Design an enzyme around this catalytic site. Structure first.
Site, PDB file in Angstrom:
ATOM      1  N   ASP A 181       0.825  -1.207   0.000  1.00  0.00           N
ATOM      2  CA  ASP A 181       0.000   0.000   0.000  1.00  0.00           C
ATOM      3  C   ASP A 181       0.861   1.258   0.000  1.00  0.00           C
ATOM      4  O   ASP A 181       0.426   2.297   0.484  1.00  0.00           O
ATOM      5  CB  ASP A 181      -0.961  -0.022   1.204  1.00  0.00           C
ATOM      6  CG  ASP A 181      -2.287   0.744   0.977  1.00  0.00           C
ATOM      7  OD1 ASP A 181      -3.062   0.836   1.981  1.00  0.00           O
ATOM      8  OD2 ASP A 181      -2.594   1.249  -0.129  1.00  0.00           O
TER       9      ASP A 181
ATOM     10  N   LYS B 153       2.442   4.636  -1.121  1.00  0.00           N
ATOM     11  CA  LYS B 153       2.195   5.802  -1.962  1.00  0.00           C
ATOM     12  C   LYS B 153       2.270   7.028  -1.059  1.00  0.00           C
ATOM     13  O   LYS B 153       2.146   6.890   0.165  1.00  0.00           O
ATOM     14  CB  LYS B 153       0.850   5.730  -2.686  1.00  0.00           C
ATOM     15  CG  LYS B 153      -0.338   5.473  -1.795  1.00  0.00           C
ATOM     16  CD  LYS B 153      -1.612   5.382  -2.608  1.00  0.00           C
ATOM     17  CE  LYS B 153      -2.783   4.952  -1.760  1.00  0.00           C
ATOM     18  NZ  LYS B 153      -4.054   4.801  -2.543  1.00  0.00           N
TER      19      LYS B 153
ATOM     20  N   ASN C 205      -0.186   7.651   1.744  1.00  0.00           N
ATOM     21  CA  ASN C 205      -0.178   6.745   2.884  1.00  0.00           C
ATOM     22  C   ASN C 205       1.071   6.896   3.732  1.00  0.00           C
ATOM     23  O   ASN C 205       1.392   5.993   4.516  1.00  0.00           O
ATOM     24  CB  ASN C 205      -0.337   5.289   2.436  1.00  0.00           C
ATOM     25  CG  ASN C 205      -1.713   4.997   1.883  1.00  0.00           C
ATOM     26  OD1 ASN C 205      -2.618   5.815   1.988  1.00  0.00           O
ATOM     27  ND2 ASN C 205      -1.876   3.823   1.301  1.00  0.00           N
TER      28      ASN C 205
ATOM     29  N   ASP D 286      -1.093   2.584   7.378  1.00  0.00           N
ATOM     30  CA  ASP D 286      -2.170   1.773   6.832  1.00  0.00           C
ATOM     31  C   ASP D 286      -1.695   0.351   6.582  1.00  0.00           C
ATOM     32  O   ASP D 286      -0.762   0.120   5.812  1.00  0.00           O
ATOM     33  CB  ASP D 286      -2.682   2.386   5.542  1.00  0.00           C
ATOM     34  CG  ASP D 286      -3.074   3.845   5.717  1.00  0.00           C
ATOM     35  OD1 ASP D 286      -3.306   4.267   6.872  1.00  0.00           O
ATOM     36  OD2 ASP D 286      -3.083   4.587   4.718  1.00  0.00           O
TER      37      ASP D 286
ATOM     38  N   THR E  98      -2.739   0.461  -5.667  1.00  0.00           N
ATOM     39  CA  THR E  98      -3.133   1.658  -6.363  1.00  0.00           C
ATOM     40  C   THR E  98      -2.502   1.625  -7.752  1.00  0.00           C
ATOM     41  O   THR E  98      -1.322   1.274  -7.873  1.00  0.00           O
ATOM     42  CB  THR E  98      -2.646   2.877  -5.558  1.00  0.00           C
ATOM     43  OG1 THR E  98      -3.304   2.865  -4.293  1.00  0.00           O
ATOM     44  CG2 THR E  98      -2.977   4.179  -6.248  1.00  0.00           C
TER      45      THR E  98
HETATM   46  O1  M77 Z   1      -3.995  10.567   7.897  1.00  0.00           O
HETATM   47  S1  M77 Z   1      -4.895   9.543   8.317  1.00  0.00           S
HETATM   48  O2  M77 Z   1      -6.272   9.858   8.524  1.00  0.00           O
HETATM   49  C1  M77 Z   1      -4.239   8.796   9.777  1.00  0.00           C
HETATM   50  C2  M77 Z   1      -4.313   7.432   9.875  1.00  0.00           C
HETATM   51  C3  M77 Z   1      -3.712   6.774  10.938  1.00  0.00           C
HETATM   52  C4  M77 Z   1      -3.031   7.470  11.890  1.00  0.00           C
HETATM   53  C5  M77 Z   1      -2.935   8.884  11.828  1.00  0.00           C
HETATM   54  C6  M77 Z   1      -2.202   9.656  12.756  1.00  0.00           C
HETATM   55  N1  M77 Z   1      -2.106  10.981  12.712  1.00  0.00           N
HETATM   56  C7  M77 Z   1      -2.773  11.620  11.739  1.00  0.00           C
HETATM   57  C8  M77 Z   1      -3.493  10.991  10.765  1.00  0.00           C
HETATM   58  C9  M77 Z   1      -3.579   9.579  10.771  1.00  0.00           C
HETATM   59  N2  M77 Z   1      -4.840   8.379   7.172  1.00  0.00           N
HETATM   60  C10 M77 Z   1      -6.054   7.630   6.804  1.00  0.00           C
HETATM   61  C11 M77 Z   1      -5.914   6.888   5.480  1.00  0.00           C
HETATM   62  C12 M77 Z   1      -5.160   7.570   4.355  1.00  0.00           C
HETATM   63  N3  M77 Z   1      -3.683   7.367   4.433  1.00  0.00           N
HETATM   64  C13 M77 Z   1      -3.002   8.159   5.499  1.00  0.00           C
HETATM   65  C14 M77 Z   1      -3.510   7.819   6.879  1.00  0.00           C
END
Ligand code: M77
Lengths: 20, 353
Positions: free
Chosen positions: B169, B171, B174, B187, B204
């Site tokens: 995953d 990219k 992420n 992720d 993706t």
């Molecule tokens: O930024 S998130 O909402 C996020 C996820 C997990 C932990 C996180 C911690 N801090 C901020 C944002 C976070 N995110 C959701 C899916 C898309 N890819 C990047 C991760």
């Protein structure tokens, strides 16, 4: 140019995975 | 040869020390993998602040722990929607992986719990936002800046692959940037613990390895291909294979042709040709020398791998940080209620969560 081609692709934003 | 005695001995010792680190890391991972933690907090321990991200998976919310004032990112999944979307196994596996791994560039699961309606994973809040946003804003990263991030991914995949975890995953969307400018991988919904081959079509389009597109059984080499795509995109500002529609992207990926901006150094182009190698018998990360073909490549000659791991390298970019709870590096989303039904939903399915 390659950059212009990128902008024209419509895929400059966040990209979904295949399942989405 | 390329190295005199002292350099050869130093490199050999360094490579043996990696083996020793990874052996211990595997022992630790397997203990937690076989006995996962569960139910380490509850919803009313936290104040809900703001939505940080939303998607088919669910939502990630900035929350504040009521006692400590510490902020966290809470991923919320609706158990019924997970079942409907046939994501039970991925959701259970994501939480199991996150509670079992331990590496400086992998986000930490601080708490997890569930209630009648939802599953909750409370992770450290990574306030710098997605690499994606910074990359699109700045346009492209200099080679040293791209290299700093790439080195963290190389080490992270070296770690994950030693645990037999394929990531699948990768990219910029992420990868998050922390307050010190280092990368956090968050992720794990597509990750899979498998020693040999696997077959699922997932990922993706721009980042898919040819063998995935071609419906082959594939292995951890797909992650090294994806690293090549990432390095290219970081350094160019656009990925190596793009088109209006995925089907066209796939044709370019499987073609065996890639073109580079004129500002790419020769060292970068050589690395990328060896990562973006359609022939699996030739792809770096998939040869007898393993990850060492990447770590020892000329493009990484200035990288101090231990210093990166120890987080002692000054990051080339520090995101703006106005203070705890600042969300300015994330987008704004419509806020939706967190409904908890009086009746338990999908209990059996999520026993392990
Ligand atoms: O930024 S998130 O909402 C996020 C996820 C997990 C932990 C996180 C911690 N801090 C901020 C944002 C976070 N995110 C959701 C899916 C898309 N890819 C990047 C991760």
């Amino acid at each position: 140019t390659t950059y212009a081609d990128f902008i024209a692709s419509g895929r400059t934003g966040r990209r979904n995975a295949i399942h989405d | 040869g390329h190295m005199g005695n002292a350099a050869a001995a130093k490199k050999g010792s360094e490579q043996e020390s990696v083996k020793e680190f990874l052996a211990k890391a595997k022992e630790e991972f397997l203990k937690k993998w076989e006995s996962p933690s569960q139910n380490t907090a509850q919803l009313d321990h936290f104040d809900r602040i703001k939505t940080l991200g939303t998607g088919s998976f669910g939502r990630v919310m900035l929350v504040k722990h009521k006692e400590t004032g510490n902020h966290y990112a809470m991923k919320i999944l609706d158990k019924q929607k997970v079942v409907k979307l046939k994501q039970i196994e991925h959701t259970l596996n994501e939480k199991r992986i996150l509670q079992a791994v331990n590496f400086p560039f992998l986000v930490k699961l601080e708490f997890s719990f569930k209630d009648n309606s939802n599953l909750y994973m409370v992770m450290e809040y990574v306030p710098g936002g997605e690499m994606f946003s910074h990359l699109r804003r700045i346009g492209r990263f200099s080679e040293p800046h791209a290299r700093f991030y790439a080195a963290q991914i190389v080490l992270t995949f070296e770690y994950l692959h030693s645990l037999d975890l394929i990531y699948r995953d990768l990219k910029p969307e992420n990868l998050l940037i922390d307050q010190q400018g280092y990368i956090q991988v968050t992720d794990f919904g597509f990750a899979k613990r498998v020693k040999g081959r696997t077959w699922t079509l997932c990922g993706t389009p721009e980042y898919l390895a040819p063998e995935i597109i071609l419906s082959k059984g594939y292995n951890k080499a797909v992650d090294w291909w994806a690293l090549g795509v990432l390095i290219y995109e970081m350094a160019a500002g656009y990925p190596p294979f793009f088109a209006d529609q995925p089907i066209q992207i796939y044709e370019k990926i499987v073609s065996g042709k890639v073109r580079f901006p004129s500002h790419f150094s020769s060292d970068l182009k050589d690395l990328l040709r060896n990562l973006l190698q359609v022939d699996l018998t030739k792809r770096f990360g998939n040869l007898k020398n393993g990850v060492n073909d990447i770590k020892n490549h000329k493009w990484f000659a200035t990288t101090d791998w231990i210093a990166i791991y120890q987080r002692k390298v000054e990051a080339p970019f520090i995101p703006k940080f106005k203070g705890p709870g600042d969300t300015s590096n994330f987008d704004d989303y419509e806020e939706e209620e967190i409904r908890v039904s009086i009746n338990e939903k999908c209990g059996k399915e999520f026993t392990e969560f």
